[PDB]
């Protein structure tokens, strides 16, 4: 268990239940004390959040090219924020807000983290990525960070093998139920969470 | 007594022998008790689908010489009595009127000791205003004997004062067009007894006894059994002098022949004088049976009394002999009950109770049934005959001969008898009878008028409204009881057409009502019957409306999450005339888009171009809010229409100000840009875009909030009318009119009262008028507050802030930039 002390954690439109900034600070600390390191945010819908936090990250078929398959996160919560919501309305056309999740990996996996300036998920970058990770795609027990699109945010792709070794806990950053599709308000990011959101230093050169 | 459908019909045919009446009594004065005596004696049983008991059928049979005493046309010895159920507290004023309006007579119950209470007095006053004839029964005599141990003369004088009080109310408020309608014991219009023990009597019952053994027609005998008539026991002479020659006091006949026998039984039985009781019983010819012969104390007293003077008989006697039939009553009730010309063909048909003329059926209420969630229309035929299959004109409250507003020409599924909790289908039903109808609940909310003439006006309409102006959040204390609450809300919603249960976006279970009291009893019914589980209920909250009253300062723009779709729109106010038209079915969402456009253009000054481009109404797809498509040359525009409409349904249900519904908000879609590929413009992409653009556009059109306002109608004696104004002056009340009922000192005051000022209103009005006032309020209109809802210190803003905190929202109202595209 990595959720800290308190009541049963659940995800809701009203926000993550039994999850205060203080409880996050405890969960984060106890994670580092066990050799885990924070690597970014993942925004998704409520049921997915329940699945990820209590069942763990599990490989699944996703709508892209096979060679880029993996678990996608973002160092900047603002980027992951945009994905923290329903992608499909129900019968009544209701689109709920999702939840921001914090993603942790064993520090033993850090040697497999690389960064690049090229745009990911594109054929022109596949070669450079395969160079850095020292093997053909897809990513395995390694990760790649780079602009999601030209001149845009940085995104991180955790190879599925690595993704399944993560520990994911809720963020203290709420989504807005009354502004679904809006952007992350910097003022709504708890200062004490920002203080524990520093990212590791990634390698720009092959191992 | 069990009857077949045939016998019932033959009984409803002779409408001269029908008695439509109700019981006017305080719950604490054994109202239900006396009612039980009646149903257990003359209750009509019938030799599947159940309903909520609204009316009871009673059968009474009398003699040829008993019928001869009836001063109205009669036909036979059989009599059908309709006992119309009535509310338990006067606070339910609207349904008190409904019951009285379909009745012609009234059994008024008063207490021996406490006499006539304030409530009973107020209700009786209303009954007389409906031109209803009263018969009185003085209840709880037992208390005067067992507890107070009064003397015979004391008890008599007590009755005299009681009868006096009643007649003061009667002579004051009874309509002069009815003649002397005061009650007199010597005439048989007053009964005495105790519902508790199940005994009661009239002077006529005792007159019948002594009529023989005094060689006197009971007419003269009962004239003596009340007032100053004295039978000297020593001389065996009748006198009007309360003293003999030697100046010794004489006992009045009432005390001697009526009270004495009763007092003697009470004394013998309650003092366990086993030697007297038998002799006393044989004397009055009261025969006991086996088990009963071993009883003693109250047990024996109850058995002896209720077989000596069965309560139900005394009551039925008065009802049949003195209460008017439909034929008699409608002759002077017609004008009052017809909102049209007095010499109209239909009004004349009601005066004559004409079974042949055009149908005039009055629907007083809708009754919950076991037949799914359907409601049966309960009411009364005043003219013509209702028939199964017969196509009728269903005229709603707002209907007027000429327009087709609030009109539905449908067919009656089945006409049924409402035998309390059960239902019996029948072919037809002549005028003068109470009846139920199947297949109307979807055209009538509660009250209405059924006709067959294309020139008939409505009958005196009872104002009602379904608008949920107050609501509460319902929550279970034990999380395991959740399912029981879900189904409880489901069935609470079915026991009343005016109750509303729904779920907010945040998942809260909401229960909304038409008033403070109405919502109160619904939550009591829910926690004890429909759910039965311990509930956590929030304080009552008033429902508000979010609106705009100017056009968006600038165009509202919003992007989809994937950044490929854009919606440009602008918000603007809708005229009140148009909003009212929409709420009144005039402008209809289900209407032909071209026929509707012609109406909005001709009658409401709309551009038929715009009116033909209405995409939807909202919320619930029928609210006073519109989406107008004003785009030009947009590819695939139609492929996102269902998503845009959906977004509007959610946007109008919970506005950006503080989560309240929108009203009178028109949204103009000026421009739209979409991605060529349909994969990147589905619901998940469009819905959020439209919602946020709508919010941005709303907040750019100087937002406002509207508050619900009641129309209050109060009856009150001139003396206490002052209190009405005293209470209104500190409730932001606004007097509409003050009228006085000609001849009587009864005033009707109408005024506007903000719903958020109506909490505990009846209590304060009660306090200030000594309970003389008779309140009656229905939702009238919405009122826009002048103050700025965005200002936390203003009246509107203060309301907003409190709500936002209560909902866990961010205190300050979001700026339009929040929903506008971030750039
Ligand atoms: N989601 C983010 O936070 C994020 C961050 C950066 C970039 N992106 C962009 O979004 C695209 C993919 O979005 P996505 O990754 O949210 O959707 P995806 O199609 O890659 O994955 C499908 C969904 O399965 C869900 N899920 C439910 N249970 C899961 C479990 N046990 N393990 C793993 N996933 C589970 C995930 O939340 C994810 O939303 C990428 O191509 C990338 O460009 C997304």
Three-class SS of B542-585: ECCEEEECCCCCCCEEEECCCCCCEEEEEEEECCHHHHHHHHCC
Closest chain A CA to residue B683: A89
How close does chain B come to A83, measured CA to CA in Å?
8
Q: Which residue from A82, A87, A177 is facing B506, i.e. has the nearest CB?
A: A177
Please say whether the beta carbons of B413 and B355 come within 8 A: no
H helical segments located in B384-515: 482-492
Contacts of B83 (CB under 8 A, 6+ apart): B21, B22, B23, B35, B38, B39, B55, B56, B57, B58
**Subunit contact A179:B692, Cβ cutoff 8 A:** yes
Q: Report the candidate in A49, A32, A76 with the shortest Cα–Cα distance to residue A169.
A: A49
3-class secondary structure, B62 = coil
A32 is catalytic: no
Say whether A23 counts as a known binding-site residue.
no
How close does chain B come to A117, measured CA to CA in Å?
23
**Subunit contact A182:B691, Cβ cutoff 8 A:** no
Which among B641, B691, B807, B816 is the top mutation candidate for probing chain A, defined by the most A β-carbons within 10 Å of its own β-carbon?
B691
C-alpha span between B242 and B230 (Å, rounded): 6
Separation of A70 CA from ligand 1 center, angstroms? Answer: 9
C-alpha span between B537 and B535 (Å, rounded): 6
Q: Which residues pair with B18 in a beta bridge?
A: B80
How close does chain B come to A110, measured CA to CA in Å?
31
The count of other CB atoms within 10 Å of the CB of residue B793 is 9
Please say whether the beta carbons of A77 and A68 come within 8 A: no
Q: Which residues pair with B243 in a beta bridge?
A: B249
- Contacts from B165-169 at CB under 8 Å and sequence distance 24+? B165/B115, B165/B116, B166/B108, B166/B110, B166/B116, B166/B124, B166/B134, B166/B136, B169/B116, B169/B121, B169/B124, B169/B125, B169/B128
Burial of B76 (0-12, 13-18, 19+ CB in 10 A): middle
Contacts of B63 (CB under 8 A, 6+ apart): B77
Q: Which residues of B423-456 are buried (b: 16+ CB within 10 A; e: fewer)?
A: bbebebbbbbbbbbbbebbebbbbbbbbbbbeeb
Q: How far is CA B207 from CA A196, B216, B280, B315, B319, in A?
A: 100, 9, 20, 16, 18
Please say whether the beta carbons of B21 and B323 come within 8 A: yes
Domain ranges of chain A: 1-207
Please say whether the beta carbons of B667 and B627 come within 8 A: yes
C-alpha span between B267 and B277 (Å, rounded): 9
Write out the DSSP string of B663-692: -SEEEEEEEEE--SSGGGSSHHHHHHHHHH
Compute the half-sphere exposure of residue B516: CA atoms within 13 Å on the CB side of its CA.
15
Separation of A112 CA from ligand 1 center, angstroms? Answer: 21
Please say whether the beta carbons of B604 and B597 come within 8 A: no
Give the class (CATH, top level) of A1-207. alpha beta
C-alpha span between B714 and B709 (Å, rounded): 16
Separation of A136 CA from ligand 1 center, angstroms? Answer: 22
Header resolution in angstroms: 2.5
Quick one: tokens of B635? 């590819």
Residues composing chain A: 207
Quick one: tokens of A144? 């790649």
Compute the half-sphere exposure of residue B256: CA atoms within 13 Å on the CB side of its CA.
19
**Subunit contact B643:A94, Cβ cutoff 8 A:** no
Say whether A44 counts as a known binding-site residue.
yes
Please say whether the beta carbons of B345 and B357 come within 8 A: yes
Give the sign of the dihedral formed by CA B315, CA B321, CA B323, CA B327: positive
Instruction: Give strand ranges (E) for B609-724.
Output: 614-617, 625-629, 661-662, 665-673, 703-717
C-alpha span between B231 and B389 (Å, rounded): 65
Closest chain B CA to residue A15: B506
Catalytic residue of the set A32, A124, A149, A155: A155
- The approach used to solve this structure was X-ray
Which residues does chain A have within 8 Å of residue B561's beta carbon, measured at their own beta carbons? 82, 85, 181
Burial of A55 (0-12, 13-18, 19+ CB in 10 A): exposed
Phi first, then psi: what are they for A134, rounded to 5°?
70, 25
Closest chain A CA to residue B695: A179
Say whether A37 counts as a known binding-site residue.
no
The DSSP letter of residue B652 is H
Phi first, then psi: what are they for B324, rounded to 5°?
-65, 150
C-alpha span between B753 and B328 (Å, rounded): 40
Separation of A164 CA from ligand 1 center, angstroms? Answer: 13
C-alpha span between B452 and B410 (Å, rounded): 11
Q: Report the candidate in B471, B462, B473, B545 with the shortest Cα–Cα distance to residue B515.
A: B471
Quick one: tokens of B530? 């429909």
Closest chain B CA to residue A63: B679
Pocket of ligand 1 (CB under 6 A): A 42-44, 48, 51-52, 55, 57-58, 60, 62-64, 71-74, 79-80, 83, 148, 155
> Quick check: A14 contacting B, CB < 8 Å?
yes
C-alpha span between B104 and B323 (Å, rounded): 8
Q: Which residues pair with B381 in a beta bridge?
A: B361
Return the residue matching tokens 């450079």. A128
Write out the DSSP string of B431-454: TT-EEEESS-TTT-SS-EEEES-T
> Quick check: B659 contacting A, CB < 8 Å?
yes
Strand order in the sheet with A113-115: A71-73, A154-158, A143-147, A113-115
Peptide bond between residue B223 and the one before it cis (omega within 30 degrees of 0): no
Q: Report the candidate in B397, B399, B433 with the shortest Cα–Cα distance to residue B418.
A: B433
C-alpha span between B823 and B817 (Å, rounded): 9
Please say whether the beta carbons of A132 and A119 come within 8 A: no
Please say whether the beta carbons of A89 and B683 come within 8 A: yes
C-alpha span between A194 and A25 (Å, rounded): 11
Q: Which residues pair with B418 in a beta bridge?
A: B423
Please say whether the beta carbons of B653 and B619 come within 8 A: yes
CA angle B706, B711, B715 (to 5 degrees): 160
Quick one: tokens of B572? 């603007």
C-alpha span between A59 and A47 (Å, rounded): 16
Separation of A48 CA from ligand 1 center, angstroms? Answer: 9
C-alpha span between B75 and A108 (Å, rounded): 104
How close does chain A come to B698, measured CA to CA in Å?
14
> Quick check: B808 contacting A, CB < 8 Å?
yes
C-alpha span between B343 and B176 (Å, rounded): 21
Closest chain A CA to residue B804: A178
C-alpha span between B672 and B644 (Å, rounded): 11
Burial of B83 (0-12, 13-18, 19+ CB in 10 A): buried
C-alpha span between B620 and B653 (Å, rounded): 8
Q: Using N-to-C axis directions, what is the helix angle for B593-604 and B576-583, rounded to 10°?
A: 140
**Subunit contact B808:A12, Cβ cutoff 8 A:** no
Instruction: Give strand ranges (E) for B280-420.
Output: 360-368, 375-383, 386-387, 391-395, 407-411, 415-419
Contacts of A139 (CB under 8 A, 6+ apart): A70, A129, A133, A157, A158, A159, A160, A162
C-alpha span between B776 and B23 (Å, rounded): 21
**Subunit contact B819:A177, Cβ cutoff 8 A:** no
Ligand 1 atom 21: the closest Cα is on which residue?
A: A62
Peptide bond between residue B274 and the one before it cis (omega within 30 degrees of 0): no
Q: In chain A, positions 159-188, which contact chain B (CB-CB < 8 Å)?
A: 177-183
Find how far residue A24's CA is from the centre of its chain: 16
Contacts of B780 (CB under 8 A, 6+ apart): B709, B710, B711, B752
Q: In chain A, positions 53-92, which contact chain B (CB-CB < 8 Å)?
A: 82, 85-89, 92
Atom index in ligand 1 nearest the CA of residue A58 equals: 32
Ligand 1 atom 37: the closest Cα is on which residue?
A: A44
C-alpha span between A124 and A142 (Å, rounded): 20
For each of the domains in chain B, give its residue range(s) and CATH number, in order of start: 1-202+310-325 (3.40.50.300), 203-309 (3.90.1430.10), 326-462 (2.40.30.10), 463-543 (3.30.70.870), 549-702 (3.30.230.10), 703-823 (3.30.70.240)
Please say whether the beta carbons of B20 and B103 come within 8 A: yes
Contacts of B133 (CB under 8 A, 6+ apart): B104, B105, B106, B178, B181, B322, B323, B324, B329
**Subunit contact A179:B647, Cβ cutoff 8 A:** no
Q: Which residues pair with B546 in a beta bridge?
A: B662, B705
C-alpha span between B383 and B457 (Å, rounded): 13
C-alpha span between B83 and B69 (Å, rounded): 23
C-alpha span between B157 and B340 (Å, rounded): 47
Instruction: Give strand ranges (E) for B369-479.
Output: 375-383, 386-387, 391-395, 407-411, 415-419, 422-426, 428-429, 434-437, 448-451, 470-476
Separation of A160 CA from ligand 1 center, angstroms? Answer: 12
C-alpha span between B370 and B506 (Å, rounded): 33
Please say whether the beta carbons of B262 and B141 come within 8 A: no
CA angle B125, B128, B134 (to 5 degrees): 105
Q: Which residues pair with B424 in a beta bridge?
A: B417
């Amino acid at each position: 268990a990595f959720l800290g002390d308190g009541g049963d954690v659940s995800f809701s439109t009203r926000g993550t239940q039994n999850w205060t900034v203080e409880r996050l600070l405890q969960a984060h600390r106890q994670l580092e004390e066990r050799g885990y390191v924070f690597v970014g945010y993942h925004g998704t819908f409520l049921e997915a959040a329940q699945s990820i936090v209590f069942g763990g990250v599990r490989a699944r078929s996703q709508d892209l090219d096979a060679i880029w398959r993996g678990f996608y996160i973002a160092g900047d919560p603002a980027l992951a924020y945009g994905y923290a919501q329903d992608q499909e309305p129900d019968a009544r056309g209701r689109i709920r807000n999702g939840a921001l999740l914090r993603v942790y990996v064993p520090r033993s996996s850090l040697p497999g983290f690389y960064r690049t300036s090229l745009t990911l998920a594109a054929p022109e970058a596949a070669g450079e990525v395969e160079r850095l990770i020292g093997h053909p795609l897809p990513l395995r027990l390694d990760a790649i960070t780079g602009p999601e699109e030209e001149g845009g945010h940085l995104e991180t792709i955790l190879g599925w093998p690595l993704a399944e070794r993560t520990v994911v806990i809720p963020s203290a950053i709420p989504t807005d139920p009354r502004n679904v599709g809006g952007d992350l308000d910097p003022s709504s990011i708890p200062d004490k969470e920002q203080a524990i959101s520093a990212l590791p230093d990634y390698a720009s050169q092959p191992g | 007594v069990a009857f077949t459908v045939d016998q019932m019909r033959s009984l409803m045919d002779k409408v001269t022998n029908v008695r439509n009446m109700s019981v006017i009594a305080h719950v604490d004065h054994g109202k239900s008790t006396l009612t039980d005596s009646l149903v257990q004696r003359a209750g009509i049983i019938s030799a599947g689908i159940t309903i909520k008991s609204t009316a009871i059928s009673l059968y009474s049979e009398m003699s040829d010489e008993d019928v001869k005493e009836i001063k109205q046309k009669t036909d036979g010895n059989s009599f059908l009595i309709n006992l119309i159920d009535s509310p338990g507290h006067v606070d339910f004023s609207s349904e008190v009127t409904a019951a009285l309006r379909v009745t012609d007579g009234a059994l008024v119950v008063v207490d021996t000791i406490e006499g006539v209470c304030v409530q009973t007095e107020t209700v009786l006053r209303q009954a007389l205003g409906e031109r209803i004839k009263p018969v009185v029964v003085i209840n709880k005599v037992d208390r005067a004997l067992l507890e107070l141990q009064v003397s015979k003369e004391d008890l008599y004088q007590t009755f005299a004062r009681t009868v006096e009080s009643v007649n003061v109310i009667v002579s004051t408020y009874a309509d002069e067009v009815l003649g002397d309608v005061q009650v007199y014991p010597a005439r048989g219009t007053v009964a005495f007894g105790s519902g508790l023990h199940g005994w009661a009597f009239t002077i006529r019952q005792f007159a019948t006894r002594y009529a023989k053994k005094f060689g006197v027609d009971k007419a003269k005998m009962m004239d003596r059994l009340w007032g100053d008539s004295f039978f000297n026991p020593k001389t065996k002479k009748w006198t009007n002098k309360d003293t003999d020659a030697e100046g010794k006091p004489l006992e009045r006949a009432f005390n001697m022949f009526i009270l004495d026998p009763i007092f003697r039984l009470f004394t013998a039985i309650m003092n366990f004088k086993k030697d007297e009781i038998p002799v006393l019983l044989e004397k009055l010819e009261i025969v006991l049976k086996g088990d009963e012969k071993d009883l003693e104390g109250k047990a024996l007293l109850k058995v002896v009394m209720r077989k000596f003077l069965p309560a139900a008989d005394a009551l039925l006697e008065m009802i049949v002999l003195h209460l008017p039939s439909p034929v008699t009553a409608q002759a002077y009730r017609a004008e009052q009950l017809y909102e049209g010309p007095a010499d109209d063909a239909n009004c004349i048909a009601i005066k004559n109770c004409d079974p042949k003329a055009d149908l005039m059926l009055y629907v007083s209420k809708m009754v919950p049934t076991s037949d799914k969630g359907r409601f049966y229309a309960f009411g009364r035929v005043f003219a013509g005959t209702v028939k199964s299959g017969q196509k009728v004109r269903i005229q709603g409250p707002n209907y007027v001969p000429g327009k087709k507003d609030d009109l539905f020409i449908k067919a009656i599924q089945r006409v049924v008898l409402m035998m309390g909790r059960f239902v019996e289908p029948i072919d037809d039903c002549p005028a003068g009878n109470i009846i139920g109808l199947v297949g109307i609940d979807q055209f009538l909310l509660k009250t209405g008028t059924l006709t067959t003439s294309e020139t008939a006006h409505n009958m005196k309409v009872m104002k009602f409204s379904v608008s949920p102006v107050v609501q509460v959040a319902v929550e279970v204390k034990n999380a395991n009881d959740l399912p029981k609450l879900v189904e409880g809300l489901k069935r609470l919603s079915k026991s009343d057409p005016c109750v509303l249960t729904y779920m907010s976006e945040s998942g809260e279970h909401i229960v909304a009502g038409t008033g403070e009291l109405h919502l109160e009893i619904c939550l009591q019914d829910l926690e004890h019957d429909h759910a039965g589980v311990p509930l956590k209920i929030s304080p009552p909250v008033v429902a508000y409306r979010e609106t705009v009253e100017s056009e968006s300062s600038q165009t509202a723009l919003s992007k989809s999450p994937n950044k490929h779709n854009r919606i440009y729109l602008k918000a603007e106010p809708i005229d009140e005339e148009v909003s009212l038209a929409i709420e009144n079915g005039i402008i209809n969402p289900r209407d032909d888009f071209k026929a509707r456009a012609r109406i909005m253009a001709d009658d409401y000054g709309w551009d038929v171009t715009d009116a033909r481009k209405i995409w939807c109404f909202g919320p619930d797809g029928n609210g006073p809010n519109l989406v107008i498509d004003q785009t030009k040359a947009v590819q695939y525009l139609h492929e996102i229409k269902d998503s845009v409409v959906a977004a509007f349904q959610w946007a109008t249900k919970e506005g950006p100000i503080f989560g309240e519904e929108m009203r009178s908000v028109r949204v103009n879609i000026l421009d739209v840009t979409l991605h060529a590929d349909a994969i990147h413009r589905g619901g998940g992409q469009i819905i959020p875009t439209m919602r946020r653009a709508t919010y941005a556009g709303f907040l750019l059109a100087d937002p406002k909030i509207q508050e619900p306002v009641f129309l209050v109608e109060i009856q009150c004696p001139e003396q206490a009318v002052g209190g009405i104004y005293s209470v209104l002056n500190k409730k932001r009340g606004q007097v509409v009119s003050e009228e006085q009922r000609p001849g009587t000192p009864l005033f009707t005051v109408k005024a506007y009262l903000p719903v958020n000022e109506s909490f505990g209103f009846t209590g304060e009005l009660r306090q200030a008028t000594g309970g003389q006032a008779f309140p009656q309020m229905v939702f009238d209109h919405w009122s826009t507050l002048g103050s700025d809802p965005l200002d936390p210190t203003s009246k509107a803003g203060e309301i907003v802030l409190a709500a936002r905190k209560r909902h866990g929202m961010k205190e300050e109202v979001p700026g339009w930039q929040e929903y506008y595209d971030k750039l």
